[PDB]
Nucleic acid binder design. Structure first.
Length: 825
RNA sequence: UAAAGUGCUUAG
RNA sequence: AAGCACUUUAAA
């Protein structure tokens, strides 16, 4: 049966009101039935751009019969839309279109009609809405997307165009926007955000090579390139598109570069009657084209197939404009781009506004034919700044921290329940020359002092201290350390940086060894900063079950008046690699301690294939530490795309239902299902310049919005719960997909904001609630758990196929000592 | 691998 | 290529 998403149970009333601007723009649509036609192109699986050009040419030539004065819109797929009905029948209409010259056949056919009248009735709330191309909001999206997709180079939901800001290496940054539409209160809204990316600069291939290899001058010192030069240049040119200047335009896909120059590059010239004349490329272009090759000492692009084997000098080829860099940018290019692409919050807002002001929607033919009117000014909103919760730390005095501006420090505070660390070891995978014995000795001295001042005094001398240069030497070492020492709290592995040592250390200490490990980079060991040490101590104390702080028992919502558990779930995708799904669960009464379980799943699967069992295990452990039955389950979810919300819900909800049918008997606790997501393109700004926080100029921590830019009838809200420091903050969006607990807007909003302050790894306000963050961490920890076994699967005699049997599910299974604990930090 | 925030990821 | 990069973080 169909599911029923609960509606708005009310709006929020808590917190200081604040005026805001938003990138959402209103859209006037007529309450008119508009007609949808299913378009099929006969050469299948083509680019969307060529399909768009096909239909444009079709409309150009076939208006005498069919389209006439109309100007339909097309999604690049099997969806065309038209304002007035079209003079074609139920049966399809096959038309021929021309475009070396390869024509297409197209079959357009009416399927149904979408009523924007029903949409207008939904947005105003006059009618209750819940009793691909067939929904009307998608048609609005297509109408608004049609024009920019002809003027600008389209990527995904976004649009770019050429400007000049060289990144280096024949690359440049193209600016542009992201466009999206969504139904909000009273009006369709249009999201427009600023984006930029990397493209190959359009220029002669001579200069592209010149810029790739940094041969600043080649004219005056004419040099024939090298082996290393050629390898790098082939790496950077192989796969790209080039145009030929000696023939009007002529475009090829370059697939290799010759090993030898045009002077020495010989091919069998093909004569009529199948005759052969061996000739060199430079000779060929001299005798057929009357072209004195300026650089015949330079190699040639091989554009043709293995049968044809065409050879073009770099001298005549240009880089075709409009090809985006897919291969990873370097460190240098990344730094340069973020130097150029960085915008603070007010800068970003004053960019978006001028951009949408330049778009001139009033003079867009495809907006005019559908009687659209999009608002030119940003959306004015009013939001509420929630009150941050207090946190009780421990010690003799029981200090309490008041988080100002979504941040506090542990300086002067102690853990609620500190732990003594009696037996501990340390393993430097750095060399003797990287850190002297004295360096690590002082490092450990100050770590011990700061730990005692944190209320968690790590006591005594290191039980073990030894260097190691072997990645495959961590399995023996740990084994030794497990048996010689009985009751070892933890070890520390100091690392030189990125290394497989970390992967195998985590794999052993979490699956084989089953003991606590804290890894530290050498620089932080040798350049000591107390803040780093304090965060390390936080992670360690949590790793030994020590509760850092608790949420003040007084300042809490009424939901805590009953045993409640808190769950966060996340799924991470391979890109034929396995997918990883993790779910966590609070173990204590106050939301600080979490256990977790993790499973492996089919690649590219959004839904969580197995859920009930996982929830089962979690619930069990809750009883084990609570002896109580959780009456309310608060499920936080991240990962599901907006396209596939409800059906996932069904299984997941019926899974949790199932997981609660098992425990005891006649057990139906209150389930509340919320989906968190940070991917959206809604960005809220301060309408009052005075209230911008920090140099970034963001909104304050605790800002929430429940009004005219949110959902018409479903229970969603924005909560920018984090200190915005760098640029425009990302307001995490929450959407209530289920509530049996019947909670008001104020209650759930402030609960999520409080959960954003209960993060153990950081004495700050984090963007999303703690269970979701922990689930993400569990996913990544399992991802490292299943890295291809060192010196066994890699380079098996370059990728290696996985082992699908249940041993893969046990390669992610955690040693029993490390499963019940918070090894996530 | 002290951490958070951010933007490039990477999805025709 | 799961992984980069930058900014900030225990003076008073």
């Amino acid at each position: 049966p169909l599911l029923m998403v609960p509606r708005r149970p009310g709006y929020g009333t808590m917190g200081k009101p604040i005026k805001l601007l938003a990138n959402c723009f209103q859209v006037e649509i007529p309450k008119i039935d508009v007609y949808l036609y299913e378009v099929d192109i006969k050469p299948d699986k083509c680019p969307r751009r060529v399909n768009r050009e096909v239909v444009d040419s079709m409309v150009q030539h076939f208006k005498v019969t069919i389209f006439g004065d109309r100007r339909p819109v097309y999604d690049g797929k099997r969806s065309l839309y038209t304002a007035n009905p079209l003079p074609v029948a139920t049966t399809g209409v096959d038309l021929d279109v021309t475009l070396k010259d390869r024509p297409f056949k197209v079959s357009i056919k009416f399927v149904s009609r979408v009523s924007w009248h029903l949409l207008h009735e939904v947005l105003t709330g006059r009618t209750l809405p819940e009793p691909i191309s067939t929904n009307p909001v998608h048609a609005v999206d297509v109408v608004l997307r049609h024009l920019p997709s002809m003027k600008y180079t389209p990527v995904g939901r976004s649009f770019f165009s050429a400007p000049d800001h060289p990144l280096g290496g024949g690359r440049e940054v193209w600016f542009g926007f992201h466009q999206s539409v969504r139904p909000a209160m009273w009006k369709m809204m249009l999201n427009i955000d600023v984006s930029a990316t990397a493209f190959y600069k359009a220029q002669p291939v001579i200069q592209f090579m010149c810029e790739v290899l940094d041969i600043h001058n080649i004219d005056e010192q004419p040099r024939p390139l090298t082996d290393s030069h050629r390898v790098k240049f082939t790496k950077e040119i192989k796969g790209l598109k080039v145009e030929v200047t000696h023939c009007m335009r002529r475009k090829y896909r370059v697939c290799n570069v010759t090993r030898r120059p045009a002077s020495h590059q010989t091919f069998p010239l093909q004569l009529e009657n199948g005759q052969t004349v061996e000739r060199t490329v430079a000779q060929y272009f001299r005798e057929k084209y009357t072209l004195q090759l300026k650089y015949p000492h330079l190699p040639c692009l091989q554009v043709g197939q293995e049968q044809k084997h065409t050879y073009l000098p770099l001298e005549v080829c240009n880089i075709v404009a409009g090809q985006r860099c897919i291969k990873k940018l370097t460190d240098n290019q990344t730094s340069t781009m973020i130097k150029a692409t960085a915008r603070s919050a007010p800068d970003r807002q004053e960019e978006i506004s001028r951009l949408v002001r330049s778009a001139n929607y009033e003079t867009d033919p495809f907006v005019q034919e559908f009687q659209f009117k999009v608002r030119d000014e940003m959306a004015h909103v009013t939001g509420r700044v929630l009150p941050a919760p207090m946190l009780q730390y421990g010690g003799r005095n029981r200090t309490v921290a008041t988080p100002s501006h979504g941040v506090w420090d542990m300086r002067g505070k102690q853990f609620h329940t500190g732990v003594e660390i009696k037996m501990w070891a340390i393993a430097c995978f750095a060399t003797q020359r990287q850190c002297r014995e004295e360096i690590l000795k002082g490092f450990t001295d100050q770590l011990r002092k700061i730990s005692k001042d944190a209320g968690m005094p790590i006591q005594g001398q290191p039980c073990f201290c030894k260097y190691a240069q072997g990645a495959d030497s961590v399995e023996p070492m740990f084994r030794h350390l497990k048996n010689t020492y009985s009751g070892l709290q933890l070890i520390i592995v100091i690392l030189p940086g990125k290394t497989p040592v970390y992967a195998e250390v985590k794999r052993v200490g979490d699956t084989l060894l089953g003991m606590a490990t804290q890894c530290v980079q050498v620089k932080n060991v040798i350049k000591t900063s107390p803040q780093t040490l304090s965060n390390l101590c936080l992670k360690i104390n949590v790793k030994l079950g020590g509760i850092n702080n608790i949420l003040v028992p007084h300042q809490r919502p009424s939901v805590f008046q009953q045993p409640v558990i808190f769950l966060g779930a996340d799924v991470t995708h391979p890109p034929k690699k396995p997918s990883i799904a993790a779910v966590v669960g609070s173990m204590d009464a106050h939301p600080s301690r979490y256990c977790a379980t993790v499973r492996v799943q089919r690649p590219r699967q959004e839904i969580i294939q197995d859920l009930a069992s996982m929830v089962r295990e979690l619930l069990i452990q809750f009883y084990k530490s609570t002896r109580f039955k959780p009456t309310r389950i608060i499920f936080y979810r991240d990962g599901v795309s907006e396209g596939q919300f409800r059906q996932v819900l069904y299984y997941e909800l019926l899974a949790i239902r199932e997981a609660c049918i098992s425990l005891e008997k006649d057990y139906q606790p209150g389930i509340t299902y919320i989906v968190v997501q940070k991917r959206h393109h809604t960005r809220l700004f301060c309408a009052d310049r005075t209230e911008r926080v920090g140099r970034s100029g963001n909104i304050p921590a605790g800002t929430t919005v429940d009004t005219d830019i949110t959902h018409p009838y479903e229970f969603d809200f924005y909560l920018c719960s984090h200190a915005g420091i760098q640029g425009t903050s990302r307001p995490s969006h929450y959407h209530v997909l289920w509530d049996d607990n019947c909670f008001t807007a104020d209650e759930l909003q402030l609960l999520t904001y409080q959960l954003c302050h209960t993060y153990v790894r950081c004495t700050r306000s984090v963007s999303i609630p703690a269970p979701a963050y922990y689930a993400h961490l569990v996913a990544f920890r399992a991802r490292y758990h299943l890295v291809d076994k060192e010196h066994d699967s890699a380079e098996g005699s370059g990728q290696s196929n996985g082992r699908d049997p249940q041993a893969l599910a046990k390669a992610v299974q955690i040693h029993q000592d490390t499963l019940r604990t918070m090894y996530f930090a």
